[PDB]
Amino acid sequence: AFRVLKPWWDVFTDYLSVAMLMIGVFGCTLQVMQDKIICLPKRVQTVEMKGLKTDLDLQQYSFINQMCYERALHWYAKYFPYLVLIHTLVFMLCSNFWFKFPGSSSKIEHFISILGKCFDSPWTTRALSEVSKKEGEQAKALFEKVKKFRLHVEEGDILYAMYVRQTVLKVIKFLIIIAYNSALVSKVQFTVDCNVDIQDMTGYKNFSCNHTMAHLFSKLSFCYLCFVSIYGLTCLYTLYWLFYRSLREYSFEYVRQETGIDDIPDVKNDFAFMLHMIDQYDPLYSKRFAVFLSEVSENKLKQLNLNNE
Amino acid sequence: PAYRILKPWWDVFTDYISIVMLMIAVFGGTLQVTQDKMICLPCKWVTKDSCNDSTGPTGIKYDLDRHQYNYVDAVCYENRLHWFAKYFPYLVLLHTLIFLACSNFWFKFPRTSSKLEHFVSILLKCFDSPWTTRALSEGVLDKKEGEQAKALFEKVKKFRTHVEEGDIVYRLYMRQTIIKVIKFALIICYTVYYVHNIKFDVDCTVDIESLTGYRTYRCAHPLATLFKILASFYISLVIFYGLICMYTLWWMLRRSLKKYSFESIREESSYSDIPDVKNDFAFMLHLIDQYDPLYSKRFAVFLSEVSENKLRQLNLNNE
Amino acid sequence: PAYRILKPWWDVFTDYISIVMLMIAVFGGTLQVTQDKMICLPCKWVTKDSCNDSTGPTGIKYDLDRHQYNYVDAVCYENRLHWFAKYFPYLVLLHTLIFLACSNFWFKFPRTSSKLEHFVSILLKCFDSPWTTRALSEVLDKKEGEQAKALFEKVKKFRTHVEEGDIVYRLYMRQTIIKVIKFALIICYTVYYVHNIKFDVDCTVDIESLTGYRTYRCAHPLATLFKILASFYISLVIFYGLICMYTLWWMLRRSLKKYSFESIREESSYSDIPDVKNDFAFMLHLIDQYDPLYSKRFAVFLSEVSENKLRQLNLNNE
Amino acid sequence: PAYRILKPWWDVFTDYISIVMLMIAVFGGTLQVTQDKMICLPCKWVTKDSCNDSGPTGIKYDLDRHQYNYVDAVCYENRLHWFAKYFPYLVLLHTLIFLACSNFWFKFPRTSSKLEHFVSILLKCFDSPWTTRALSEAKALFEKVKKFRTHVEEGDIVYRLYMRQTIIKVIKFALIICYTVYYVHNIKFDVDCTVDIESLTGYRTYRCAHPLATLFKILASFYISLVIFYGLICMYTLWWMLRRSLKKYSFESIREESSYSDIPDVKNDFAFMLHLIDQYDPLYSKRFAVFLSEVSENKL
Amino acid sequence: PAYRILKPWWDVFTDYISIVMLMIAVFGGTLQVTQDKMICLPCKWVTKDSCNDSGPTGIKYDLDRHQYNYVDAVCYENRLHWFAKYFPYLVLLHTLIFLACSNFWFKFPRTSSKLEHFVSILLKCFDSPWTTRALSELDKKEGEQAKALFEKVKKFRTHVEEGDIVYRLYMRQTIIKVIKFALIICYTVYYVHNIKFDVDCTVDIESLTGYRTYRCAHPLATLFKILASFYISLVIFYGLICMYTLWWMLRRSLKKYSFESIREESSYSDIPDVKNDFAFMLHLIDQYDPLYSKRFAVFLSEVSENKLRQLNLNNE
Amino acid sequence: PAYRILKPWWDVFTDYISIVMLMIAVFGGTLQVTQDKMICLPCKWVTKDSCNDSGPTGIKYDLDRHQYNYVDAVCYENRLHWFAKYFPYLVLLHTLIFLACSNFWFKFPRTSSKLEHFVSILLKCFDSPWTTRALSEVLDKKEGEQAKALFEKVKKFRTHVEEGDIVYRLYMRQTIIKVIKFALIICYTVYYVHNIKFDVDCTVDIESLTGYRTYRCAHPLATLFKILASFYISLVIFYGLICMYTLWWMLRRSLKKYSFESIREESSYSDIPDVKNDFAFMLHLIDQYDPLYSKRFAVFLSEVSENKLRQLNLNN
Numbered sequence A: 001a002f003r004v005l006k007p008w009w010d011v012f013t014d015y016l017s018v019a020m021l022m023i024g025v026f027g028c029t030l031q032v033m034q035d036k037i038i039c040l041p042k043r044v045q046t047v048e049m050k051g052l053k054t055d056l057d058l059q060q061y062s063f064i065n066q067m068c069y070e071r072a073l074h075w076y077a078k079y080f081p082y083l084v085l086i087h088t089l090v091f092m093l094c095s096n097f098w099f100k101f102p103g104s105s106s107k108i109e110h111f112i113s114i115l116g117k118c119f120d121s122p123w124t125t126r127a128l129s130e131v132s133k134k135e136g137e138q139a140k141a142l143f144e145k146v147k148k149f150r151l152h153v154e155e156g157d158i159l160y161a162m163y164v165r166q167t168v169l170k171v172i173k174f175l176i177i178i179a180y181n182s183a184l185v186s187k188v189q190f191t192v193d194c195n196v197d198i199q200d201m202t203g204y205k206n207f208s209c210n211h212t213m214a215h216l217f218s219k220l221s222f223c224y225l226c227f228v229s230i231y232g233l234t235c236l237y238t239l240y241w242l243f244y245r246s247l248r249e250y251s252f253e254y255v256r257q258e259t260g261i262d263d264i265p266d267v268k269n270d271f272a273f274m275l276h277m278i279d280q281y282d283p284l285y286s287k288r289f290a291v292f293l294s295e296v297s298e299n300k301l302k303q304l305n306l307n308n309e
Numbered sequence B: 001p002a003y004r005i006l007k008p009w010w011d012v013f014t015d016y017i018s019i020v021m022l023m024i025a026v027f028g029g030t031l032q033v034t035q036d037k038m039i040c041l042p043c044k045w046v047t048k049d050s051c052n053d054s055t056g057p058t059g060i061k062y063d064l065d066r067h068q069y070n071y072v073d074a075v076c077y078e079n080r081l082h083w084f085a086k087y088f089p090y091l092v093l094l095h096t097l098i099f100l101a102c103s104n105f106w107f108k109f110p111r112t113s114s115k116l117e118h119f120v121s122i123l124l125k126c127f128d129s130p131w132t133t134r135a136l137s138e139g140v141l142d143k144k145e146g147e148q149a150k151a152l153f154e155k156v157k158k159f160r161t162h163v164e165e166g167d168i169v170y171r172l173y174m175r176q177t178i179i180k181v182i183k184f185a186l187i188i189c190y191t192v193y194y195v196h197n198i199k200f201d202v203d204c205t206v207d208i209e210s211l212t213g214y215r216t217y218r219c220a221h222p223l224a225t226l227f228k229i230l231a232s233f234y235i236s237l238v239i240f241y242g243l244i245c246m247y248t249l250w251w252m253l254r255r256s257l258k259k260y261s262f263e264s265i266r267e268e269s270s271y272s273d274i275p276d277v278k279n280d281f282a283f284m285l286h287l288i289d290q291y292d293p294l295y296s297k298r299f300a301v302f303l304s305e306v307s308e309n310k311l312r313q314l315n316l317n318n319e
Numbered sequence C: 001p002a003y004r005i006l007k008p009w010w011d012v013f014t015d016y017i018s019i020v021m022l023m024i025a026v027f028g029g030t031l032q033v034t035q036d037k038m039i040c041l042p043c044k045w046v047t048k049d050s051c052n053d054s055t056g057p058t059g060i061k062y063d064l065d066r067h068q069y070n071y072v073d074a075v076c077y078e079n080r081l082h083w084f085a086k087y088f089p090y091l092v093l094l095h096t097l098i099f100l101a102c103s104n105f106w107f108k109f110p111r112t113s114s115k116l117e118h119f120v121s122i123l124l125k126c127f128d129s130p131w132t133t134r135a136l137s138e139v140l141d142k143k144e145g146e147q148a149k150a151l152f153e154k155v156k157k158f159r160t161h162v163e164e165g166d167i168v169y170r171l172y173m174r175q176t177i178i179k180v181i182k183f184a185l186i187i188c189y190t191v192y193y194v195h196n197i198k199f200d201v202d203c204t205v206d207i208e209s210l211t212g213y214r215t216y217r218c219a220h221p222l223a224t225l226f227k228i229l230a231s232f233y234i235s236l237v238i239f240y241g242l243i244c245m246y247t248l249w250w251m252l253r254r255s256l257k258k259y260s261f262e263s264i265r266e267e268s269s270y271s272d273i274p275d276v277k278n279d280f281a282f283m284l285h286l287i288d289q290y291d292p293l294y295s296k297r298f299a300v301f302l303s304e305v306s307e308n309k310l311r312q313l314n315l316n317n318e
Numbered sequence D: 001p002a003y004r005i006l007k008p009w010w011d012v013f014t015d016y017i018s019i020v021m022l023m024i025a026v027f028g029g030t031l032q033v034t035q036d037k038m039i040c041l042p043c044k045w046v047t048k049d050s051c052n053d054s055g056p057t058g059i060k061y062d063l064d065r066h067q068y069n070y071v072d073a074v075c076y077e078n079r080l081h082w083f084a085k086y087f088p089y090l091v092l093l094h095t096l097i098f099l100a101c102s103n104f105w106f107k108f109p110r111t112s113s114k115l116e117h118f119v120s121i122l123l124k125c126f127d128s129p130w131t132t133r134a135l136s137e138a139k140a141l142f143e144k145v146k147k148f149r150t151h152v153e154e155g156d157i158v159y160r161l162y163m164r165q166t167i168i169k170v171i172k173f174a175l176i177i178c179y180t181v182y183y184v185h186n187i188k189f190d191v192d193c194t195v196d197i198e199s200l201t202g203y204r205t206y207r208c209a210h211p212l213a214t215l216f217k218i219l220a221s222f223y224i225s226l227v228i229f230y231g232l233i234c235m236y237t238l239w240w241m242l243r244r245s246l247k248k249y250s251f252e253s254i255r256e257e258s259s260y261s262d263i264p265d266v267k268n269d270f271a272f273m274l275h276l277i278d279q280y281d282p283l284y285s286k287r288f289a290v291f292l293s294e295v296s297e298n299k300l
Numbered sequence E: 001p002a003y004r005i006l007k008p009w010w011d012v013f014t015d016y017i018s019i020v021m022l023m024i025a026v027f028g029g030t031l032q033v034t035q036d037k038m039i040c041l042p043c044k045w046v047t048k049d050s051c052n053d054s055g056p057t058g059i060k061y062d063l064d065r066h067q068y069n070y071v072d073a074v075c076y077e078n079r080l081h082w083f084a085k086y087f088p089y090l091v092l093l094h095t096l097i098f099l100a101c102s103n104f105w106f107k108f109p110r111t112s113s114k115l116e117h118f119v120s121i122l123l124k125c126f127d128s129p130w131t132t133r134a135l136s137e138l139d140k141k142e143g144e145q146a147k148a149l150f151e152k153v154k155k156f157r158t159h160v161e162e163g164d165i166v167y168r169l170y171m172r173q174t175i176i177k178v179i180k181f182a183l184i185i186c187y188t189v190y191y192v193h194n195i196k197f198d199v200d201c202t203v204d205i206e207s208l209t210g211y212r213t214y215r216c217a218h219p220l221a222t223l224f225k226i227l228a229s230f231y232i233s234l235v236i237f238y239g240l241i242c243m244y245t246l247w248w249m250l251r252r253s254l255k256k257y258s259f260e261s262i263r264e265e266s267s268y269s270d271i272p273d274v275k276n277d278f279a280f281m282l283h284l285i286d287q288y289d290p291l292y293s294k295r296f297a298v299f300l301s302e303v304s305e306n307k308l309r310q311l312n313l314n315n316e
Numbered sequence F: 001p002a003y004r005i006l007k008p009w010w011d012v013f014t015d016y017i018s019i020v021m022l023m024i025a026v027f028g029g030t031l032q033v034t035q036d037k038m039i040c041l042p043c044k045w046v047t048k049d050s051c052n053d054s055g056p057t058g059i060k061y062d063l064d065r066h067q068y069n070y071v072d073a074v075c076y077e078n079r080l081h082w083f084a085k086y087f088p089y090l091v092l093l094h095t096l097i098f099l100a101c102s103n104f105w106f107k108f109p110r111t112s113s114k115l116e117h118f119v120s121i122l123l124k125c126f127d128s129p130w131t132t133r134a135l136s137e138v139l140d141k142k143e144g145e146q147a148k149a150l151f152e153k154v155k156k157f158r159t160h161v162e163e164g165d166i167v168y169r170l171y172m173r174q175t176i177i178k179v180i181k182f183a184l185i186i187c188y189t190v191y192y193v194h195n196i197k198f199d200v201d202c203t204v205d206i207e208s209l210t211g212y213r214t215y216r217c218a219h220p221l222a223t224l225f226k227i228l229a230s231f232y233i234s235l236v237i238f239y240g241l242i243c244m245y246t247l248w249w250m251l252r253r254s255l256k257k258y259s260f261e262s263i264r265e266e267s268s269y270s271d272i273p274d275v276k277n278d279f280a281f282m283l284h285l286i287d288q289y290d291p292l293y294s295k296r297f298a299v300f301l302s303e304v305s306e307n308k309l310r311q312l313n314l315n316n
């Protein structure tokens, strides 16, 4: 189960990435339009006014339009949606980066399988009733399974460090995106002074142009900037929650406070990290899984099984 | 999928209204990209920054190129067309996306989503269980069916202990309702205020005399009446959405959804031991009552210790 | 999926007519969005704001720019072309969406959707029950007898649940009434305004200060096409009217809230099948309209004589 | 669909002809919507409202672009033949009515219920293990078959609806061929329009070129060919429903081949759909014979 | 679907080739709809009803835009070759005929019924565990399904050997495909050179325009030549596949299948030498996978039925 | 579909890369079909077939709109490079050929049958209830019959597939073709990507129809068709690198010999032989995807597990 190991901030970032992809696709379809920039030459040769004849054909106007689109419009105003698509693709790929690793996937699947089968175990409810037959043998087998999990997962710390790496990658990518987008968002202007030297072709040298979708691209850039800022705030909170409490150390003393048996130990490394995942999801899962960690609880279960047999 | 039981008639109504509103947003958006322009004609005689408006008739010669006309159209469309006429479909799309996010936030938020999927799964599988019909009819039972019945009883008990502790689902549904109704109020206020600025005839004065020769132009916005009727239809849809939202708020606040009394089911059957469920469990059971009281009636038989006593006795007989 | 049993011939016909109307609605909407325009040429000689209509021939020099022509087209399309000719496909789309909403509010409203799903499940379970064959014959396995008894109890519980109140019948009656009155209004205003879709329009918008001419003659190229999309649409509505009217007659020629099993209780030996009423009666009448065999083999689960026969048969097998 | 066997070769062949007719109708419809127009040019010189044609230099007409568009629209509306303008819509309507005639035998709830009952019992007999034992030499299934026979021999509504559908599908073919053949010569590339817009344009008569006429020609010819095929198929269908009586089916060959000779001669709607079964594959009918003979019921 | 088992490598190759030619037909038709115009400029100096072809300033033709459009339409209709105008429509029609000829095997009700029955019995023989158990050399449900399946196989074998309708239909389909391949290659190879970028039109519209001869450029002519070369290559590949299929049918009698190697490998050495249509569909099975015929052949020998009935007698 | 198991990480990576290349091919083709042209303006001053380039007012060329269109069409046909014109069609064809090379493994009927049968038995063994008990080391009649039939089918399928290697040979050929085509694509695209220029000097000699000899043209989509091409090249490089790694994965170890020493040593069933050829190849592919499938299947081929299964069946 890969949905359960995803906290609220991860789903929020996934939906923000989906919205950013939609913005990029809309910008690309905006760039599909043929009519992009409209240019007019400068210094052309009850008050009644008369029009200024520029003595230019339609083809000369089209040539001026394309020359000023290529050599006067800023590269950001032309290739913003493609950059948005690339950035949102990299953001989406790195969202499940700690999910797709082989060992990470194996330990996550083992944890969710063990936790789910513990959740439908009658003896968990039996031990909760004790705190506040055949199923005894199943509980003994599940205790050996929990010990196997402790030997199989706790020796490593790949998951927490790899999650920290993915979150740091998200934070730095948000920083770079915000930086260059704030630096280049002022380049998307309506009126552009185009100064291409096509005087030998059209007769004029200075042109004043307008980018027709400059306002729409500016609004799209500001919306993308707001989305990236929300993404960065979410990732900054993720970094704060990751680093303010040591996820290499899960204190089960909160279980010890209301539950009388004190034998359950303080798990370390990957076990503590994934238990913090499940605590962010639902703390009842951890408070129930706590009772399967003790050894004197196993001895009491063995005593009950000996009485039954 | 299986969440339809948790969506009452108001939620379905807002779901379909949001779908139609998104269709409106898409239609207005594609028209705005495609055929949104302003055909601008200069005023030959001006008087104090305004058009003067002073043997066969002959056309007025403006001596303007086609591209000077396009430049004038783009400049006046950018500068003097009201922002509402330019950004109505995108504002509608943003509002509908936020409405859909508010209506589907509790389905995606893990803390409430876990409780919701647990409730839906165990309630549906209790509804199709055979021992529910066996108990409500008041023999021999199959081994597999007996194991399913005892497992379902234990799961219902553990879920009842798991859910009644807090009221996260009730609080989230409440907050979604107030957010939706205040956003409806804001949407209707600003849309009604700014809906009259979508005009066919727009007088622009953009100071491009150095490039064209004329200063004031009289532009025609072709998609102004179509955008006006689209905005009126959007306002009507938002009005319906908001009225449904205040009905949902009144339904939430009139009674106490955090307290369920099973007096209807418990008096009807012989089981007088069914407890008065409270908190979040009571809230989603009230939602199911808004869908169908039969689901709650068939689920209440799993909350009584008399029923589990009879099940245990029959299972001991079978074993 | 399994709702096809609850759709009689009139419902299927109205669904197909609504689909065709939606097709012509999106067709006209595409035309109106993409090539809807108005070619307006000024009348050089005029008399009291009216078109006077008065060596090889030479073209009339109007001395108008292309953009002046575009402005004249836009103004006389906005001001003088009738609103019906401009917004007919949108009206057709809105009416088709309203008709579809009225047709599917039966299945989308949760209070009646739950009852409809329960009735469909119970009816299909009784349809596939082997004991019904024996019930229509006049040995079963333990599983067959057990499931027959369980579905007998389920049928009894469902009859207690649904027969208490009529919400399905009331909603169906209201939907038919709303569809009939919508057809009446649609036919009235469409027939009244279909004569304004004309190819030739004389426009007089007073833009002499911007163009130089007062009155113009305009050709609306799509108008004739819209005409063959309008009258045709009217015919469809007429069908959608008459069929719906028949449905209304079917809801008024007899009380659908009283289903009589007289034919079955006379043909079959079981004479104890009660005269079911209310929503149960209404859905049984709908199923009778679909296929009488479903109701015929469902009627054996409403009689206690068949229950006693099943109990005795199960005891004989035991 | 569920009636994969009740449709013989003529039914499926006409269905595919209808599909190809529908796609060419849609192609012609988008053709007429998107770029269908006509380019109209006046005759400058005149001799009794004509043009005389008394290096080379182009002829000036003193017409604006909008005057040309007005002439195009007016001549397209007035002097282009209505067939050349509404051929794809006529084809689309004809194919929609053809598909409605084909699927009304499927959509009517009484006939749909009867067909689904026969299909369900036929398939459950086809997958039944006892028919193999009978052919080598289910009681509730036999009683169901007898009850279905008593239910379905009461009326022949399915055969009557099939007959009516065949008559509509052949007379519509006749009308389509007559009118399309008569009017296919009105799709000309070069037309003459005399629309009397001299007060707005200055010219009276114009020569117009219809760019999509020739395509609309050959497609129409193509359409005619397809219709002919349809009609020919329908023609033989009429023969198939007039040479033999489909309301009475004889099981003589199967009951002679099989050990049981007590299979009665089936009548009515049962006979008609068993004739359809024999047209598709005789195995289904041969197999359903042994689920009908009362001698095999006594053996069952 | 269920007919995937009956289609050998040539059939699936032709299907993918045909869908590719449909893709190029759709592309060509869309481009012929959208940008199949031509740009015609009048020849200023006419010499013997032709073009003399005899700082700089542009040539003034005194023609409106609408006269240019009229000249374009008239010369596109009259003096452009019919191949350059109807290449995508002809390609679509040919591909549709190829699809119809390839799928008429599955749509003719007699042959479709035979093929569906063959597929059903082969698949249920694949699902049968007793078929594997017998080849390896008793459950009640296994015995019932087994007895039903051998009786099914005997009934099918008696049914299908009556007529070789399916083999003759496949022969006719291959012959139609190869002759249509020959005709397509002949006329397309002849007429592909007529797609030219530069054409000269002489349409006699001097009464309306003032010029007699015009020089026209067809912008889509080179793209249409590329598409025609692609179509010719695809049809050449399809035709070579058809040659191999016809040679496969004519190499050995497909109406005569011997199980000699199969019954020599297995303990059962009395599997009969089937013939006609059953032999044909079994040859197609061998073309797809010899394992299907390998596991199906045990249902035809009398020794296998004798031991099946002996084991049923032991069970009963 | 069912063949998701047989696709390792390199295969799904190339699938996503091919999907992205098809996406950019569709985008480039849409741009090429819709708005690919060039704006050509005549050069008033000509010197040695080139432009001299020796308030302000415009230059009057005295050319109609249709003369401009004719000049644009002729200089797009004759002087713009073929790579700039046909880059979207080339990337579309290359992506189609790469997808065909990827899926010819799945579509070839012999290898399709082998892969489908392998995947079917592997999925029914992976979900077999007997595997959990065997790994944990009475039997239900239905479950025992299913286990016995599954064991016999695994044995006979191993004998059926061990005879020859056709799946490995096709995979080898597909990887070789995919790397050779990658090399050719990179070479020719890198060589011809420099011909996509925004400014093109055209000289087409239409002075008789236009009046000018040399024109200067702007190709509006050139720069875009530059960067997309670069992007395309980047994707191809990635594709090639992945293919190169796959080629190395074919050569560093013998893919036709599989040893169960990773399972037979750990498990008590040390009697597992070394499978060979195609069976070894698909088992190595499973190990590339997930070793759990091969580990759970490995108990169904050893004979000690067969002995213990027969003992459990006898105990019932």
Ligand SMILES: CCCCCCCC/C=C/CCCCCCCC(=O)OC[C@H](COP(=O)(O)OCCN)OC(=O)CCCCCCC/C=C/CCCCCCCC
Pocket (backbone or CB within 6 Å): A029, A030, A032, B025, B026, B028, B029, B030, B033, B034, B035, B089, B090, B093, C025, C026, C028, C029, C030, C032, C033, C034, C035, C036, C037, C089, C090, C093
């Ligand atoms: C906010 C999200 C919005 C999502 C946007 C989706 C993608 C948008 C990008 C579009 C991609 C390519 C389409 C561009 C076509 C532009 C052609 C263009 O502008 O040419 C100008 C010219 C101006 O048109 P007139 O004839 O004056 O029309 C005036 C109407 N009386 O237009 C043309 O020549 C043809 C226009 C092409 C239309 C293309 C779009 C049509 C969309 C179909 C609408 C579907 C209707 C649905 C049902 C309607 C209600 C029943």
Ligand SMILES: CCCCCCCC/C=C\CCCCCCCC(=O)OC[C@H](COP(=O)(O)OCCN)OC(=O)CCCCCCC/C=C/CCCCCCCC
Pocket (backbone or CB within 6 Å): A025, A028, A029, A032, A033, A034, A035, B033, B034, B035, B036, E030, E034, F025, F026, F027, F029, F030, F033, F034, F088, F092
């Ligand atoms: C592998 C090859 C596959 C080829 C498939 C191509 C599909 C399209 C084929 C049909 C072509 C139709 C031609 C339409 C031309 C109509 C007249 C014309 O020239 O239109 C120009 C007009 C100018 O824009 P206006 O809206 O007027 O701008 C100013 C007002 N805002 O519109 C256009 O730009 C083109 C008109 C529509 C053509 C394109 C239609 C399909 C476009 C698909 C968009 C692809 C976007 C992909 C999104 C993600 C990208 C990473």
Ligand SMILES: CCCCCCCC/C=C\CCCCCCCC(=O)OC[C@H](COP(=O)(O)OCCN)OC(=O)CCCCCCC/C=C/CCCCCCCC
Pocket (backbone or CB within 6 Å): C027, C030, C034, C035, D025, D026, D027, D029, D030, D031, D033, D034, D035, D211, E025, E026, E028, E029, E030, E032, E033, E034, E035, E036, E037, E088, E089, E092
């Ligand atoms: C019953 C059918 C219902 C569906 C109909 C839906 C209508 C189409 C929806 C898309 C709206 C876009 C249409 C825009 C039209 C106005 C734009 C305009 O001014 O175009 C000018 C210009 C007119 O001249 P040309 O075509 O160059 O003439 C050359 C002479 N041979 O037209 C264009 O450029 C094309 C305009 C856009 C066309 C896009 C839609 C065409 C659809 C193609 C249908 C066939 C597709 C598959 C082909 C099958 C193989 C044969």
